[model samples]
Target chain A: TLPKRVKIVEVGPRDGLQNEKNIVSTPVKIKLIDMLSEAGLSVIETTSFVSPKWVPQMGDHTEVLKGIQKFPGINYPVLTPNLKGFEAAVAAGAKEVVIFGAASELFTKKNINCSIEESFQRFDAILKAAQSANISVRGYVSCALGCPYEGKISPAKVAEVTKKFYSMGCYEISLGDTIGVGTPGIMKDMLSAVMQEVPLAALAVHCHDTYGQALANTLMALQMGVSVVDSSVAGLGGCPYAQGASGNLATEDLVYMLEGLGIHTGVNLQKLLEAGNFICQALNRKTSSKVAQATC
Target chain B: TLPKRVKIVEVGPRDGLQNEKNIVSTPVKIKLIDMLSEAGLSVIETTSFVSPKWVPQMGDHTEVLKGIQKFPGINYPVLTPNLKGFEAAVAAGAKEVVIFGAASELFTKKNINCSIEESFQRFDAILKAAQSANISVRGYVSCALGCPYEGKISPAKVAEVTKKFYSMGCYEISLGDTIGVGTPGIMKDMLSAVMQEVPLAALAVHCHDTYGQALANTLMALQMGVSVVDSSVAGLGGCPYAQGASGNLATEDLVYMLEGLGIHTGVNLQKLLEAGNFICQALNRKTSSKVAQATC
Candidate 1:
């Protein structure tokens, strides 16, 4: 069933800026979130509360969270690696946080220094802590469609982690094609299996436009009953591991497609374009959004 | 019904190079076509035989046609806009030619300085000449999905023009989204109407990636039983009318998607990338192909 309404999880503030080699000021990040919120995005990922030693880009997460003015009815979710990161984010006034792992064991171990089962233990601690604090938890499963280190990932593994996330208390689970190497067929196979385990409304597709199939893959996901999608403004991010690979699908392009399908997203395309344009100028690069490029 | 195999018409040589501002030499044009032929493309549009005053880039059409080494079983088609161009192309040893027209009367007048009905009369002479000379005639219907001058073209008009082309003895009709303003929904609607007049096997889609919907649109056309796709190596060529627009769907991206769907295209992706590499480097421009960029 194709969705008549879709929720866009704007990941521009965090994921979009994280991959850039240049360091942006904390004020710029806050400005981007405010712009995204003003553009009518209901959910915006504000920042990630990762260790400064690991990702120096997100070092000012505390200042960023405190600096931005929170819009009414807009949920801002920050990435939390573990209980410690979760505690720091909560202390810094993050009401919603995302716990990310990977479907590929190598990716999971290499990313967070633990096995899949071991990573689950860390997420379990954060879920328990989040439950105690009455904070909403979202889960991210990387390499859900494919793996850079491991060529192809099994859909069963994706479903396994999704079920674990659902059971452990993740209100929403985002399945990520981390390398952007997925097509509609693989997306259909993977999503069909994952949809079997998780509620249809709880699943979101986070696709990269690396192979230029992100929109096609997302459309397949929508047809298969998914209602949530993750995108970045101006297509800001790229995979550091995969050189020259594009990151998330552009929010402007995503909204353009959704609006064309008559799927209500409540996002203002003009305002979204303005936000995308602002960021692209700030990054001193051309926008990856085709709508922005065409309309500009 | 979806087709298991698709024929891709590589249009990089003529369509891709013509839109570029710089004039390439005859030797470079021949090398590009030879590279495309070596890359396993069955049909490659070599160059346009249009007047040199209109398009100076393709002025060396005769030299380009005469210089290339023709491989067995690889068909090289040149664009012949009028009966004069057709006669010149046939005189230069052309075996196949594409007669171009437009569904939108305004586009037809602006592009070729003739009405749609008048354009067919010109093609009629070309068709007769081609038949006598045993040269195959392929038809191109531009602005099939949407028109830059007049948006939201009726599917009936597209079908009518396509039927005329097929009845005029053109072996295949290529539906072109000249402005790249089409989505899969529009593509499905347009293809559905045209399939009634033309045989499904005789239809092809020429899509531009200006709005990043080419892959999705092509996928929809494939699902609707259209077997042929028009693409460019390195995603060359842009619409001169639509500013900041991109070129055709990248051959590398198309092959990547088609192979993922298990469709037989007979083209080698590696050699296709090499062709893309050759042209992009020779032009000193970056490739618009996400797959080529990702792998490179």
Candidate 2:
């Protein structure tokens, strides 16, 4: 009953792999990104530009940025938390960058070690730099509808932050239902509010499967005209605060959903399964994909 | 964009309890059913009448049926697998009964040890007995859209089974997305097919959180005019053949969805959580209901 198009942003190489305790070598991460690109993921988030001390898992940012075999239409976006990080990402071969912000103030302080305003200022600088470099910018809002430390997030705050990114030249602003705490009701309320601030064309939805409402929330967003979906391959990334909660919505599961809906995402489910199998083998963890297990 | 009234079938004492390997006494099961009734569940599935050699977890079908403190306003229905099981359930004092059917042919064979058509014959007998007993009967069609054994199922097959159940005098036919395999696309297709034969009011949706699509599917079902939703407390119960997949959608989670939409289901979230938490403690497992863990 919706548009038959869903553009999936594969964030596994950066977001999915970062949560793993056992860090992969830079070359391995590069290979995974290349394989994902070949699997027809046009927008693949490659790695985060952070200090080796804070994110040991992604400390090899420069090496990974240098290593991946680039795809023609695919954009390998790197996470840049601040102006300095954005500079480093640009110096490395990153043509597209993502700026991080949050709707939950407590999450902003705890997660990025800054206030919402400060995070926006940082993104402001990053946006300027990316613009000067002709690099496409994507804005990421964590805990847009929910927070671990905060009980409930005001959708106005989500809209406020999303607008900050939109005004700062972020071509796309992804609203994350972080901590997996959103129901379709809260999501609808939040998105309704956020969409009031930002055009529905520039809006995207990032959902977690923790509460098992990712699919529902995503569907609600789609019904409201969200075109982009940010998901991790094989449902990558667990919630940081809640240990043992199942994390990101699996990419294969989302693909299974989209394809079954007759949406033309252009994803080859079999090849996607092969990619999921590859990573699970490399990481020595069970594949978190339901479709991968059922078919193959 | 949806309806005002919602039907919720309390499955705590049946699906929630049956999957646990640990045994609870008949008194405990009976008390749980009575408590749920007091807490305001009109339709409560009490127990499954099957051979102890099979689902030994529900071997107390007789005691739970005969010994429980029955409430005046509630419907206590027993799950009867076949004619033999139906006979046993009747002997145990089942006032209302539910029979199993399936969409995917292989899943019908693999899970129930019979073909779809063969199972309808059993439903035929159960429905006749229900008519003679002057008791209401419910029909459950499992693996409605997809199957673990045979893969994707056609919506026509699901509708065919729903029509068969309706013809057999099982007035309340629940279309189950067993293994949480349905998305809005397939679900809409599946439901549209059934709607052609069975009226939307008599249809119910039983969804699992396997791929985190149950609530989303439920919401879609609501929009499509299917109002009844069957969920287990704390999301207990899994198909042995569909392992690592989500079990039933958590009743708490379902409540969160329903309440968020402002749809009245006549079930208190807090009271339902109390029952859900009690069973989780008894079974020594964390509550699978994401909302319960977060809010309860």
Candidate 3:
């Protein structure tokens, strides 16, 4: 009962690189996105419109969005925190945008200095502005599984936030295991609750490989019929709040599994590896992808 | 449906360290096995009683088995390729021993310098000797998924070999993805075929993380009602023939997932991590386990 085709949301250039210790040049980010598009990624999360003071790695967000060659049928979505970031993203020629919040109250407060209720108020304004600007919005619910500060998160709470996003103008709501502390059982339970609130077609899974459970957790989601998946190239971007945690699931690894399972991802693994290799060389770090490592 | 309680076979000291480039001291191997026992593992594959000429890393097998403090209820199974190794293992005080063969004919010949049929002739001798000595024998069918020499091994071939071992008085049979090339679909198909021949209670999965699909493949097997799993401490032992391939699945990672799934493994994650850390420090190599990395 798996989807015949899966949509892979490449978050490497944005979510992946945002947590890097070293700053990556805008040209490199642009090149990475271009390469991903060439590798047949349908939707790519390009850059976040957050302030440089908060995330200096994404300081060239505007340049990255404008610099890359936007292939036809490929949607490049940038992260927009609030109306201010939404306006900036639209002004920078973004056709699609994402708004993120956390399911855990403590994580939401610590991450954005606001309560869960207050974060929705901020999302409401962005949704209204995006409606006016004719821009499609995607939603992210972070800490849908577990929180670093608050610990275990309830499935009902994840469902509540996901329902809110679906009721809003967001086309899809991506559940993020922000700390990568989730397992297949948790993923199944959380997806069960969320499916009751939203259409399965309107759901995605965003996982980190911190505890090496991302792929297994994603597999659980797929079995539950959630097709859209968010992954990073070279498995970039760890949880800054959770020290020693690894990054998002590598796109190359995810693609490898999908291909092996006979699930169509429309991704070119060879080209994806080339992009991973290029980015790893630029960062002077080893690629965290097992497929890349084995092939190399 | 998943099993309520899972059996984890810790293969660190033997399958894990046997492929290490540097030879680990006998004392270190003993300490790791003792720590695994302290962490509450019911079955630990301690060492391989093979020729030091073939695997120099496991040359100190006799010292390891004789030196380790054997827990009363815990089973320490050592690898004995032929009658000679079986005799050596018995002399070293091993009550349980393992015999491994490969599903792929090419791997069988390349690994043991004997055809699949010829290898079983050797196993028959070892099994008869073990039965006379009242020693339980566990069987392993490596390359059950794919081989370095042969791209894809048929599910029927894996089942045929597994049935052979099961009918030959082996207490348990472990299907190994020796090259770590199997995915969830392939795992499901292979397990389905093997389950048709062997009882589910006597089956296990031994996976390597070479292509980053070990955990996912294991998850698929767990869903198929196969409980026992083989993993290494700190994810040691890559495919020596496949350059740049990763090691076996990490025991720490597997235990973490099992705990999260509410499956009774009876393993103490904290103590398991301690054992993993000790071995990694001894080898002076960073652990491949994401759980260990996140916790440290």
Candidate 4:
């Protein structure tokens, strides 16, 4: 059975653009977030507070977060890697923040120069800071399906990490197929393991389309009662690990499917396409969205 | 539950190339089919016997059908639109042939310049002629989920057409979402209605990716116990009705998903990618397969 209503977390601004080789202007980033809000997205990941040297595309996170118009009843969550980044995000008026780790220990070390246990120490500090500030924190477990460095990952490890995030302070945890290497069966296994430890209500699936299995894998997750999904507009962001690969699942395509399934997403297709078009034009790139390509 | 094993009908040479604007050389067509056969495709749609004036890209159908080396334990099927095409196919030593009709009356009229009833009369003649020649004939129900001209197509209409095809001595019936406008729910409803009339083993799904829902819709069919699937290499062909739309579901991506699901498809992924690359280079175009894009 599928959920009657699904929550889509728009991640194009942060996760989508961060992997893009070219940098977008701050005003364009702000405008994209505002347009996504206009399209009735309940949650949008505005930008990441990582070091500019790491991800230059998201260097202007403060400017982007502060410049966008905030819609009522919508949450704008920014990614914070550490306590320093969390403090910076709070200073920039971020009401919610995101912390991420990986299911593979090698992936966590390669990504953030720490072990999975050490990474949690950082997340624990961020959780405490956010709790004192009364800000909601969302957790991300990257490489939940497969890791580029270590190949196949254990589903039990994903469940353990997700349980820790839930037991701490994260209201929701998003399991990410960072490299888009997962298929339906693996997605089912991972979701099954994680669902045993966490409430179904507090889980989301983040899928990429590198192998064109994003929608299929997401369909498996939805069949397992996962109602929240994270997607990027126009399928922004390429995989740095896998060159010439696609990025996140397009929000336009996901919304199209949800609407067709008689599930309420509260998103307008035309407006979402417009937002995707605006970003694609700004980046001077072709959209990876099949719906946007067919329509426009 | 899904089938333990599935049959993949490679349609790149016929349906995939028919809608292409540029004409491919007969030698290249022969080579591509030979490569597909080497890659372990059990059934390959070789060419169409339609008039050159209708689809100039497939004008070398006779040469293509005659030039390719046939492999043992593999079936090569060609499409025959009418009695004349059927006779010409028999002259060319064709063993198996396909006949198609649409569920939408308007689509049938617009596509073939005949009503649904008139089209069935044509199919009936082909079936009689093929039976006398001891040839196997396959049936296609187009616009099973939707029609570009009529928008939504009814499940009862699709079921009626499929039942007629099954009763007309066709060995297997392939249901086509010609416009790629279907979601999982629509696919389920249509399949449920049609499964009551046709045996589950004789059903196949031919899905286009015009709306990016092809794999998801095909997955729904697999879950419903439909085993046979039709796909294109490199996702060739374009939608004539919906301009700038994507074509068929890429066979490489489909095989990857099937393999990941632990379903035996008896296809070599590496060899399939090589075939896809060969055609895309010959066409001087980029492949629409995400699996090909990421790997090569």
Candidate 5:
């Protein structure tokens, strides 16, 4: 019997571009998205609506959302942090939106400046508003397996948050290993426990390439029946707390796995390579994705 | 619920040093292994008894095996490529031995200058000698999930070789992602297929950090019932055929994972870090494990 084909939700545009220290031009971000869409990625995370004070790299969210020629089948989703960001995303041409919360209260406070309860309220409002507008909402829950502040998040915590997000109108929940401190053992137990509350198909894994466990964690997620995987092209993004100068699992590597499995990612390896090369060249930084560099 | 304690086989002495371009003196290899043993690692892979021409770094295998000071609880194992290498290792005081076979035909030829079947014959002879000496044997099957030369490898082929080795009286079989090209998807499929012929407890997952899928690959394998996992200290070794980069997943990193899951490995983090740091400083390289660096 053939194994199931897993879905890859490419987050390269937002995650990859947002982490870039060098401010990328609007045209460049547009070009990257266009290339990725052409590569056949269905749901590409376009940008985030957070203020420039927090994430200046994604400050051009409005321009990027309005600029790109959206593919017919693709859902160009943008991050909706608060209702304010959600309004901006909608105005900027976001047909699909993603809202995220942490599994830990400390992480929620540290990252989004809100308590877990308050964060859910924010998501609930965004979900209701998006549903009214007929816009798709994607959910992200951080530190599902382990956290820097609070270590070893309980599967019950992740499940409760996931249940909330999915029930509150989020189409899918993406589990984030924000600190990247998890192993396959931790990840498997966490996912196996979480899958009981959340159906496998509606789940995604958003792994921070910290500890170099993104791809490995992702593989575990896939085996647990997680179809959607969020990844940045060329392994764009670095964690602030991560020890090494290099971290994050590259998209080229993730796609390499999908392609080799004969799973239809609807992605063209060559085109994605060019886009990754184009951005890395412009930034004047070496790509974290080895697969792309080798081909060139 | 608490997670189970894991047995970590430290492969740095062989997998870590064997791939280095710089051929360290036999004394340094012995010192490194002794330091690793001192670090509280119960199992330390000593060295490979391959021909000097193939792996110059491991040319001092017999000396390394003979020179190192053995600790009471620590188990030292050496890689035996053929009857010649196996005999040499035994001659040098190898208490426990390992033999490796590749599922990829092209890789077996390029790697050992022998066919897959020929490699098995070599392993069979080593096993016989080891049994006679009452030495425990570890079986290694490389390219279990994927290979560099032959793109996609069948798990069934890996299963066949693993069963063959197990029947040869080898105690443990380590399934290796030699080229670091596996994702969770293929790893799950591979482990599922391999489990049909081999018991999960007798299997270990040895992953390369090249594609940064080491932890994830191990995680999937663990869910499939593998209890043992192999790792190198400070992320020491890589595949020579594919860009000559180190693919060995750092022991510090793997230990971090097992620790987070509350898996008891009888190894302390501080002790392991000191060992990793000592060897890394002596070798004049940084630890590739992100977690170790963070705490240090």
Candidate 6:
């Protein structure tokens, strides 16, 4: 039987907008986050605290987090690459932070300029810093299914990295299909190995729709007892490093599927559509959600 | 283990275009079908013989059926609702035909102006004519999982309809999520019941992407031993009767997913994209396929 309720982590602001070609103003990002909070999303990834040299669109991370009115009982998390980014985020009143690494060595070196073992050192520092301040720390393992640069990633490698993150005081871990190349078969094997190392409640699946397998792959994870999912509003965000990679699975679509399956997500579909429409209009692009598209 | 190969039924021409608001030129329809054939699709739904008053876009059914270059081994099937339409199709040199019904009684009355029991009488006539003419017959059961007017459809009801189609000389019976409201859980339950009535080899799935669950639902069917899939190129077609329903699952997205799963589809991805671009441009609308969007 499927889980009665699924936790949907909205990642549009950070993972979605970071890869957009045009830069969005800080106010718009804040407005989007406010709308998402109003839509009853329990968790929203507001922005990333990475250097402008890496993702220039997210340069206003501090201003966005500081500008949005945080709803009570809502968790806003920002991506922190290293100690410096983490310190900057905390100084901007961020309450939670996410540190990401890669399962594939080639992706680690290319994306973060370090090896898997070296990246854990950075995450360890961030986790320690967050713990002392009573701030929640989250971990992300990119290329959890496969990598564009390194090719196929073994489930053993993914399990190893997931265990590292969980052992480092990370409250939750999100496994990312950075390139959207995984199918249900791949997702099942990967989740099976990772679940052996981490608690199922602490695991979330973040999938991309590049090859149109995101929802299907996510379903396999859900059937395997992974209750948390990471999706973007308006299906925002693409992988800058992975060529031809599309955005995250649209949150509107995910909620629709979850509600149909009798899985309570506590997300209001009408409110979510309003937020999706606002962002798609602001970007002057059509929505990626099939439900949104059908409406018009 | 999943099936090593899957048969993709490209339905862009008939099921895809029949619901379109704009009527494309007959030559363009021929070109699109020819492109799909050249792309190595073994089966393609070319056109429908229904009254133009019901679906204006398919008015040139005779021309489209007669215009396209028939490839040596490819199968081109057209939809026929009654003996009159079937006779016209046979006169136009059609070798295969599809008769459609619905699992939901409300949908059957609204879509075809007849009840489920009454619709079978019409299909019986068409089946008998096809048998005499030595033409292959395929059957479609719509709203197999859920209905718009009627909220939920039981697996036993869907199985009953599938059995009727199978017993009446239909070589294959395609289960359609006419409103695209099904998920993996529902698909599994429905397929389980239908598999009991029909052999897995004679069962196919025709899913719409209205709820973004088409690919995921289709994946569940694939894992359950159902091999054939129906998809539209460039994500064409919507349910004319179901308000706010989106197009069918795009063939390009299906091909990309199948290829990634290590399943052979005998379809060329690059050529499929070319066809998708052609149709999207001809319709003057953006493609609904995620894979096509990422490439651009």
Identify the candidate with maximal DockQ: 4
DockQ comparison, 4 vs 6, better candidate = 4
Per-residue lDDT of candidate 4, residues A1-296 (tens digit): 89999999999999999888777888899999999999999999999998988778888999889999989999999999989999999999999999989998888887777999998899999999889879999989999999999999999999999999999999999999999999999999999999999999999999999999999999999999999999999999878899677999999999999999999999999999999999999999999999998996
Docking quality tier of model 3 = high
lDDT of 2 by residue, B85-149 (tens): 88888777787888777888887777668778887766777778778878778888888868877
The positional error of residue A243 in candidate 1, measured at the CA in angstroms, is 1.4
Interface RMSD after interface superposition, each candidate:
1.1, 3.4, 0.9, 0.8, 3.3, 2.7
Candidates 1 and 3 compared by TM-score, better number:
3
Model 6 residue A2 CA deviation (Å) reads 3.0
lDDT of 4: 0.93
Off by over 4 Å in 1: none
List chain B TM-scores, each candidate. 0.98, 0.94, 0.98, 0.98, 0.95, 0.97
Residue A158's lDDT within candidate 5 is 89
**For model 6 chain B, where is the 10-residue window of minimal lDDT?**
B238-247
Cα lDDT tens digits for candidate 2, A30-111: 8888889889887889999987778889899988988888878888999988778888887898998888888888888977
- Model 2 stretches astray by more than 4 angstroms: A20-22, A277-287, A293-296, B12-40, B53-55, B82-87, B103-122, B146-157, B209-212, B240-244, B266-288, B292-296
Measured against the true two-chain complex, the DockQ scores of the candidates, in the order shown, are 0.72, 0.39, 0.85, 0.87, 0.33, 0.54
State the displacement of the C-alpha of residue A252, model 2, in Å, after optimal TM-score superposition.
1.8
Task: Indicate the DockQ of the complex predicted as candidate 1.
Answer: 0.72
Best by lDDT: 4
Which structure is stronger by DockQ: 2 or 4? 4
Q: Weakest 10 consecutive residues, lDDT, candidate 6 chain A?
A: A237-246
Ranking by lDDT: 4, 3, 6, 1, 2, 5
Q: Is candidate 2 or 6 superior in lDDT? A: 6
Model 4 clash pairs are: none
